[PDB]
Design a protein around this ligand. Structure first.
Ligand code: 182
Ligand code: 182
Ligand code: 182
Ligand code: 182
Ligand code: 182
Ligand code: 182
Ligand code: K
Ligand code: K
Ligand code: K
Lengths: 251, 253, 250, 250, 251, 250
């Protein structure tokens, strides 16, 4: 009942699909699938929940990666084994630039590699760059729904707290390497923090797979720390609409 | 009073009822299994890869919370549990052994980990040892002897990937980056017992923040003998390891 | 002069914000001549500067010389003078078997095998091209009808060992670069050149727009010696693409 | 002589598998005098070796000297002669306020601020002590009755800048080690010494058992100059522990 | 027409020359060659201008490298292919020590490797050290003409601005790695900044080629930043005389 | 005692600014006997110090022990006492086929395969010897008539794996040092030793003058086990050079 080690899927479950939308959150999988025609649940194992749906009369996979590069690396690899060639990540994000507001959508051209898993596919000098066609389709899709969009570099961290220079922690300390890091990234024009893009973009770009990255701004780190409960859902829906519309252009 | 005191786990400090020890499996589906071994098991929360149950061990509240696969999610789980008052962490996992003398069904207690991860660096520079707490290690080894098991104590390679970082070539690309080509043979020669995916992060982040951490895993595959685990030995080995981690939790209360 | 090396003042640029930046100083006149009202401005060391006009708007052409260090000087001083958009036109050796001599390559991002990029951002920062610039080049290549490949470029501080050439005085390559071409090939890296890592890193980390295009004059998997006819044809072919892309970014 | 430096043969050991390894060559005679039948074997360079008997079994005491390089020579050459267990006895400077002068510290693993450890295993490999050896040292400390702390040790390749001492000739510390003592302090690192990182890495990566114990003769958060009496008392206190631990490991 | 890819020279052009003076400025080539016997233009391609001359009856090459290790590495390699075994660099420099004045001559024993190209010949732990016979000849030549000489370590940077900790720039920022780096080098006894020596000295010392390095101080970083034009040419003339005199001793 | 380890006062030195620093503590008497008025000062741990007179001027001889760590302690504490010039005399294993046993090697700079040098300057800083010291050593070698080679030395933090010795307990060499000897050989590195990188880095970055001279007792390309008598005469040859060089520097 499975051709892969973790996902619990066969090549036949995919029905010829070559594109997958890959959110971090397993609870978001159904929401993205519901936007497309005839969505069905295929599998749920660990943090990997998979749905299949129809878009413009063509099968599309939605599969969760979980938080971080390691589980992303498993999901992407096993989906690649199953036949997926195009990967579109839909994420949540904390912006670090003052001109970016909550509700804005960010398209990532390339990522700052603050992760470990990217190194298991390519040395640090290799750019965690997004596929040009995927990035184009995400930019086009953002205009299609009519959102406020920023395009640029993302800092992709193996941690939510110290690697994003959060001090509201148990220890209250940040290791020397990351002390003052946010200010450095800010000055370099880095838009935001998330936790999967570096791994995803590196492993795909170094293995002949197409990858795109899009995220909804939940919090801006220069104005607030605790997100709003209602705005969180609206921003998520906005970006989910874009990732589906982008997939339409890449079929 | 409350609904959630942390960003991800969906738990309040009040939910924990004074608990200071947590058992941290990778698989969210393993949480109920561990909690079923103790008294009064109750489901607290399920969000993302983080499933949390509360149980009673010798009259003392204990938490079971899944980390998910890998350092990044593990770092969120551990930090947010520490915010809620957890001081002791015991990881129970699955693992592939790389030494010929270690058989499937054996139990491995980790003294310290080879840091093939990225998250550990976010707490301490690479030179800092990813070392388990001595009292936690003692308890796990003592628990393994108590219920009876084939035990090996030593070093674990903790990788940020399942595939290339553990030198698996049966993949889509069929290639392994230069840095990891020939790496398994090197760890083997250095006496490293096994591969898993969370210990380097867990052990580094706890040892560098005044928290106690222990690491135990049941070997379900030996890399010199096979690649695919048996879907029965898997269940028995997990049951074996789950019994050991609860018994080690008893000694640390 | 307003700057240390270029021998240019702010007035010389006449409000220009876009520069085409070849490596070869002899290419500067060739690029300028394709545009309206081409005028020489200055020549000091490897930095030759011309000013021209594209659709009524002033544009700068300025040579960087070979390598990140002189590129970093040229880009920094042009930025000081008001340039915000940088389009590099270069020559390259392809390392993929499917890429032909005469093909044009558009760089999305570069493998940083250089030193100068590190003086602007740590290695983990991507040497990524600006999205608008890359789009302009891809559209400009599609307009003239060239065979175009889009992807990653290996940018080396060295022509020989860093590109794993063994036809050298020593005949040796340092451990770090031994087998490196094979690695890049497997990773889908299209080609080797010598300036893009520095240019892309320094621009992306300072709020400057940069694009990178190159004509293939050699494929490393078939032959090493470039033909003394295709070289001029490929250069002029890629020069037309960069000028047309500049038209879209004004 | 079967070895390059120590000046010992396989027969000189008489089947010994355990060795106590102090840094100070003047401490070898002190440790061996506490065991039955002490015999001087060889003294070459900084390596002094004494043979003793513990519970009717031959035990070796051999000085490593200060630092990883000679520790690597000593351990390797003793291993060639049949030694499978290494117990290090040293002095240390504590960096935690709750640890006092006179206290005994058992090292679980070490921060690798050394070079020699890299010659055996890459930095990511933990400089971790053998679990059985650590157990014995902790149990031996409880046996004699002493205030014991168990945890991490910073093992520096230098006495001054690597341990962030500013009372030096230059009065400066290199950028890399600036503010490093506070970093280790916040990370719960107990102390500074100069041999454990090399010893623990080279043993754990070669199937050899290694244990590490030290007496606190200075506390870095209060006073720099140690007392010329309490030093000897602490040294003699720690020696009793390492001999008692050696009994449990034979 | 050419035996090499860039320089535009054949072996015959060199006429058996084994020594080359290598300035950074292509315009310095004729000026250096004019101080010797029978000066002749050989080639000019890109930043590489080559002249041939005679010194005590022996053919000597003068060839420009351009700014930085990359073009230096090309020139030196191709000169080596054509038969050059001894390389003497004469350049300009900015001193970072208060006791070194404008107009002073500096002879480099070894260089701090703040470049990329040196790594393409030897790992960072390999010393960017000058040849003993070349260093001796330069020190002896400087004392022979009567100049204020300083011998020691040079910081060799792939960048003129941030890597030499200049803040008078478009961004006005310096990356963390190089923040406070000048003060570190100053305290370590480093004399000066230039842009080619690390590459030249590393590539020669690891390939069995002799290399020496000499430079004229035109700016002191602890004092003024704007150099005098008349003083610049005079300082260049002083250093050019020393390097030709040093070449005499090495033939 | 004004120092922590050496057990020496500023008055014990009698205003000496130069010190010859061997690795072996038994060689300290040998060098001191070559000069006028040999007097023993102190012997603690691996550090033995002897005072002598050269040309009517006081000169110190102090053992560093094997490796960077104790070398850094010795050199720092001697600098505190007033020593500004450090001349190292050691033994070495040559890795070039043209260098024979009995030859003398003067080190211009060292490959930094140590850890202690990093505690004074980052890896990019060259472990370079002082020009005057190097000049004095070369001139002294020609004065007494010895077969001399001048160049780069590999300075390792270990005797075995870092010098790619496979005749060990494990018989393995870590990936980093696998094939490393061949690399150094192609790069023209003359030899292996264990102190120069630390000595040359810590001195060149602190304003202290340092020189390095060594006697070839083995060549790695031919055989491993050296002759006994040849080892003694090579030591005496090198010691004669370092004393003659010290005469020029005072
Ligand atoms: O600041 C952030 N950093 C991130 O890495 N991120 C991506 O999702 C990571 C797991 O929530 C999302 C945000 Se936004 C946020 C702020 C506070 C609480 C939850 C999410
Ligand atoms: O080889 C391993 N490496 C690991 O890192 N590991 C830990 O669990 C990671 C998620 O399955 C578990 C094993 Se065992 C095994 C082999 C093949 C398929 C599943 C599990
Ligand atoms: O293989 C190459 N690598 C490059 O870095 N490159 C860019 O121009 C660098 C200066 O010629 C150009 C080529 Se193509 C070539 C092959 C042989 C001779 C000259 C150019
Ligand atoms: O602070 C220390 N750091 C160490 O590395 N250490 C171990 O012994 C190394 C040789 O003295 C011992 C001490 Se304690 C001490 C303080 C002052 C003088 C000698 C020892
Ligand atoms: O500070 C310096 N750093 C250098 O690397 N340098 C060498 O020439 C590099 C190209 O100008 C020369 C100087 Se001096 C100087 C100061 C200001 C403007 C031009 C030259
Ligand atoms: O190969 C060598 N490597 C070295 O680092 N070296 C310097 O002395 C180190 C301590 O003996 C000396 C030699 Se030569 C020698 C060969 C065999 C046994 C002793 C010395
Ligand atoms: K995860
Ligand atoms: K020593
Ligand atoms: K150049």
């Amino acid at each position: 009942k499975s051709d892969v080690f973790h996902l619990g899927l066969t090549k036949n479950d995919l029905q010829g699909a070559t594109l997958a939308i890959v959110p971090g959150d397993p609870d978001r999988v159904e929401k993205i699938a519901a936007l497309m025609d005839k969505p069905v649940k295929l599998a749920s194992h660990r943090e990997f929940t998979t749905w299949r749906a129809e878009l413009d009369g063509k099968p599309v996979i939605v599969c969760s990666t979980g938080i971080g590069g390691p589980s992303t690396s498993i999901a992407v690899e096993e989906l690649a084994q199953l036949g997926i060639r195009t990967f579109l990540r839909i994420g949540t994000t904390g912006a670090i630039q003052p001109h970016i507001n909550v509700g804005d959508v960010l398209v990532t051209t390339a990522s700052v590699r603050l992760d470990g898993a990217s190194l298991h596919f390519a040395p640090l000098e290799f750019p965690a760059v997004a596929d040009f066609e995927c990035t184009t389709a995400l930019v086009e899709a953002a205009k299609s729904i009519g959102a406020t969009t920023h395009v640029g570099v993302t800092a992709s961290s193996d941690t939510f707290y110290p690697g994003q220079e959060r001090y509201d922690t148990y220890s209250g300390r940040v290791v020397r390497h990351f002390k003052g890091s946010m200010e450095e990234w800010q000055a370099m024009g880095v838009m935001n923090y998330e936790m999967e893009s570096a791994t995803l973009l590196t492993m795909c770009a170094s293995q002949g797979l197409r990858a795109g990255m899009v995220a909804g701004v939940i919090v801006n780190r220069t104005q607030q720390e605790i997100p709003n409960a209602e705005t969180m859902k609206q921003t998520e829906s906005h970006a989910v609409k874009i990732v589906v519309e982008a997939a339409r252009r890449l079929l």
